Design a protein around this ligand. Structure first.
Ligand SMILES: C[n+]1ccccc1CC(P(=O)(O)O)P(=O)(O)O
Ligand SMILES: C[n+]1ccccc1CC(P(=O)(O)O)P(=O)(O)O
Ligand SMILES: [Mg+2]
Ligand SMILES: [Mg+2]
Ligand SMILES: [Mg+2]
Ligand SMILES: [Mg+2]
Ligand SMILES: [Mg+2]
Ligand SMILES: [Mg+2]
Lengths: 341, 338
C-alpha cells in the first residue's frame, strides 16, 4: 500500500536531518532528536504526508513522474508530518492533554516536561534542513520555504483564537458563534491539513498559475473546516482505543462545533446548566454536558451535517478545472467521510 | 546609534500585519502587536546594533546609502525578534520570574503556557519582514537560511543546557560540556548571526573570511555567556532586570564548573547537598561557597585574560573583516554589569 511506501523513507529522512546540520558535531543532541522524532511521528494514519504524495501523483502527468520525484513528494510529505508533530507537541501542552497515539503526550514524560518546548523547536527547524538539502538549487525553493513559514503563521493565528483566555469570561459564551468557529478552524486546521500538502503537490508538479492555486486553496479550506468539525465530534464521542487520545474539549471550555451547536438549541434553563458545567474538570460536570448534548440531539445533527457537507464538497470537487484533478479531491473527501478517528 | 535604531520599530510592526494573513484577523493582529511591544521593549538592543555596526564598518563608506542603512536596521530588528522568541521560551524552561524589570511573558495571567503559541507568532514574523524587504534581492535565501540555522543552533545548545545531572552526580559539569553549551546556545545567535548578516549586506561572500569571522564570533560569544553566568549570581536585579535562577535550576554555569574545580572533599558534599534547590538557605549556602572559593576574584581575572586574548585575535584579523569592528564589539561588553 501507499502508507508502507511512504513510511519506508522515514529512516532516510532522519539521516538527512543530522548530516546536513551542525547535529553532525553533537551526537548527544543528534541521538536525542532521533528519539524525539520517532516518538512524535510514530503511528497514526500519516494522512498529511499521504495527501502530499497523492496530490503530486494525481496532478503531475504520469509521463513526468520518476522514482526521484516520488522520493521528493514523500520527503515534502514527511516535512508536513514533522510540522504536525511540532504543532501537536505544543497543542498538547496548551490543551492539558494526557495521551496521544495511545501513549503519554511527549511533555507528560518525566524525562521531558516543559523542555518539550525546546524539542518542538528542534523539530520545526529540521524541516528547513530537509528542504534546503533537496531543493536549494531549484526554482521552487523559495516557494517551499515561504509556504512552510506561512503555514506556521496561519496555524498560530488559529491557535491564538482557540486558546485565548478572552474567548469566554465565566458564564459569557457570547463569542461561541459560527463566525468565531469558522475563523478558528480555517486558520488552525484547514491551512496545514489540506492547503499546505495540496499546494506542495502542485509546486512539485510545476503548477504555478495563481488562479489554479486560488481555486485549490478554496477547495482545501472547505475540506479542512469539515475535517475539524469531525475532529471536534470525535473528541466527545470517539472511542479512545481507536483515537489514541483522551478528549479535553469540554474540560478546557473549547469553542468546539458541539458547544456552538448546543448553544443554538439550549432552552433558557439548559443554557444555565451549560454555563455552570462547561469548562470544568469535575467528572460530574463533564458528564452533565455530555448528557445535554445527547438531549439536544447533537449526534443526529452531526450525522446529517456530515452528509450535507460531504455532498457539497463532492459537488465543489466536480466543478474544479480538470488541471486540478477533480478525482484527487473527491478521493480526499471520501477518505475522511464517516471516519471514527 | 540606539534611538536611530529604535525609530524604525513602528514600520517593522506595520509590515508584520499588512504582509500577512493578519489583515483578515484584527483580534490576532492586535494581540501580536502587544506581544511584540512587550517582548521587544527596553534593553540595550545590542544584537540589533551589532548587525547595523557590522554592516556600517564592513561596507565601504562610498556604498552606504540611507536605504542600505534602513535595511541593516531592519535585519537588526529581525535579530531582536529572534532573541525575543528565544528568551520567551527560555524563561519557561528556566522558571524565571522577571525580565527587563517586568514579569516574563509566560508569567502573565492571561498568557501562561499559551506563550508557546506567541513564540511561534514571533518567529514566523521574522520571515514576513525578510520577504517584505529582501524578496527580490540576491541575498534573500541566504538571509532566510541564516535565521533557520540560528534556530537549530540555539536549540541544540538549549538541549545541552536543560537536559535532565543525576542527584549528586555532577560528573558532566566539565569545561568540555560548558564550551558546547555556550557555543550553540549563545555564540551563534548573539554574534555570528548579526556579523554574518552585516557581511551579507556588504556583499562579502568569500568563505575564508566567513570562517575567520565565525571563529572570532564564537570566542566572543563564549566570553559573553561567562559574563551572563556571573551576572546571574552577582548582578543587581535593578540593573539587570531579571531574577537569577542558575543555582536553583542546577545549571552547568561557569560558576558551578569553577566551583567544582576548587572544592575540597567536604566542599563538594556541601555543593551536591545544596545546589539545585529552591530553598533560600541552600541557595545562600552555594553563594557562600562561591565566595569562600574566591570565584569573584577568579572571574575578574579571567574576564581580563579573555578580553586580552579576544583583542589579540581581533587585531590579527584580515583587514577586510575590520579588526576595528571586533575591537569595538569587545569594548562594548568588557566589564559590563548587565
Ligand atoms: C487540529 N489541530 C490544529 C492545530 C493544532 C492542533 C490540532 C490538534 C487537535 P487534537 O488535540 O484533537 O489532535 P485540536 O487541539 O482539537 O485542534
Ligand atoms: C543567553 N541565552 C541563550 C539562549 C537562550 C536563552 C538565553 C538567555 C539567558 P538569561 O535567561 O540569563 O537571559 P540563559 O538562560 O542564562 O542562557
Ligand atoms: Mg488538542
Ligand atoms: Mg488545540
Ligand atoms: Mg480535537
Ligand atoms: Mg534563562
Ligand atoms: Mg536558559
Ligand atoms: Mg543567564
Amino acid at each position: 500500500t501507499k502508507k508502507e511506501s511512504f513510511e519506508d523513507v522515514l529512516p532516510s529522512i532522519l539521516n538527512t536531518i543530522t548530516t546536513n546540520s551542525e547535529l553532525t558535531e553533537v551526537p548527544e543532541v543528534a541521538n536525542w532528536l532521533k528519539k524525539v522524532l520517532e516518538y512524535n511521528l510514530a503511528g497514526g494514519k500519516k494522512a498529511r504526508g499521504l495527501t502530499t504524495l497523492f496530490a503530486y501523483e494525481m496532478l503531475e502527468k504520469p509521463e513526468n513522474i520518476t522514482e526521484e520525484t516520488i522520493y521528493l513528494a514523500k520527503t515534502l510529505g514527511w516535512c508536513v508530518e514533522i510540522l504536525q508533530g511540532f504543532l501537536v507537541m505544543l497543542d498538547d501542552i496548551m490543551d492539558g492533554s494526557t495521551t496521544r497515539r495511545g501513549v503519554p503526550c511527549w511533555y507528560q514524560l518525566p524525562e521531558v516536561g516543559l523542555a518539550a518546548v525546546n524539542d518542538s523547536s528542534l523539530m520545526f527547524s529540521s524541516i528547513f534542513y530537509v528542504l534546503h538539502a533537496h531543493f536549494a538549487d531549484k526554482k521552487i525553493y523559495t516557494n517551499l520555504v515561504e509556504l512552510f513559514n506561512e503555514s506556521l503563521m496561519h496555524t498560530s493565528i488559529g491557535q491564538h483564537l482557540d486558546v485565548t483566555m478572552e474567548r469566554r469570561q465565566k458564564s459569557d459564551y457570547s463569542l461561541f458563534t459560527i463566525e468565531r468557529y469558522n475563523a478558528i478552524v480555517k486558520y488552525k486546521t484547514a491551512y496545514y491539513t489540506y492547503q499546505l500538502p495540496v499546494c506542495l503537490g502542485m509546486l512539485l508538479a510545476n503548477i504555478s498559475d495563481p488562479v489554479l492555486h486560488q481555486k485549490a486553496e478554496d477547495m482545501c479550506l472547505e475540506i479542512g473546516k469539515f475535517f475539524q468539525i469531525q475532529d471536534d465530534y470525535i473528541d466527545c464521542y470517539g472511542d479512545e482505543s481507536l483515537t489514541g487520545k483522551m478528549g479535553t474539549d469540554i474540560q478546557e471550555a473549547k469553542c468546539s462545533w458541539l458547544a456552538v451547536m448546543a448553544l443554538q438549541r439550549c432552552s433558557a434553563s439548559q443554557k444555565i446548566v451549560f454555563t455552570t458545567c462547561y469548562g470544568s474538570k469535575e467528572p460530574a460536570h463533564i458528564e452533565r454536558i455530555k448528557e445535554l448534548y445527547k438531549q439536544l440531539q447533537l449526534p443526529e445533527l452531526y450525522a446529517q451535517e456530515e452528509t450535507r457537507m460531504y455532498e457539497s464538497l463532492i459537488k465543489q470537487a466536480h466543478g474544479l478545472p480538470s488541471e486540478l484533478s477533480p478525482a484527487l479531491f473527491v478521493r480526499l473527501i471520501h477518505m475522511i467521510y464517516k471516519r471514527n478517528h
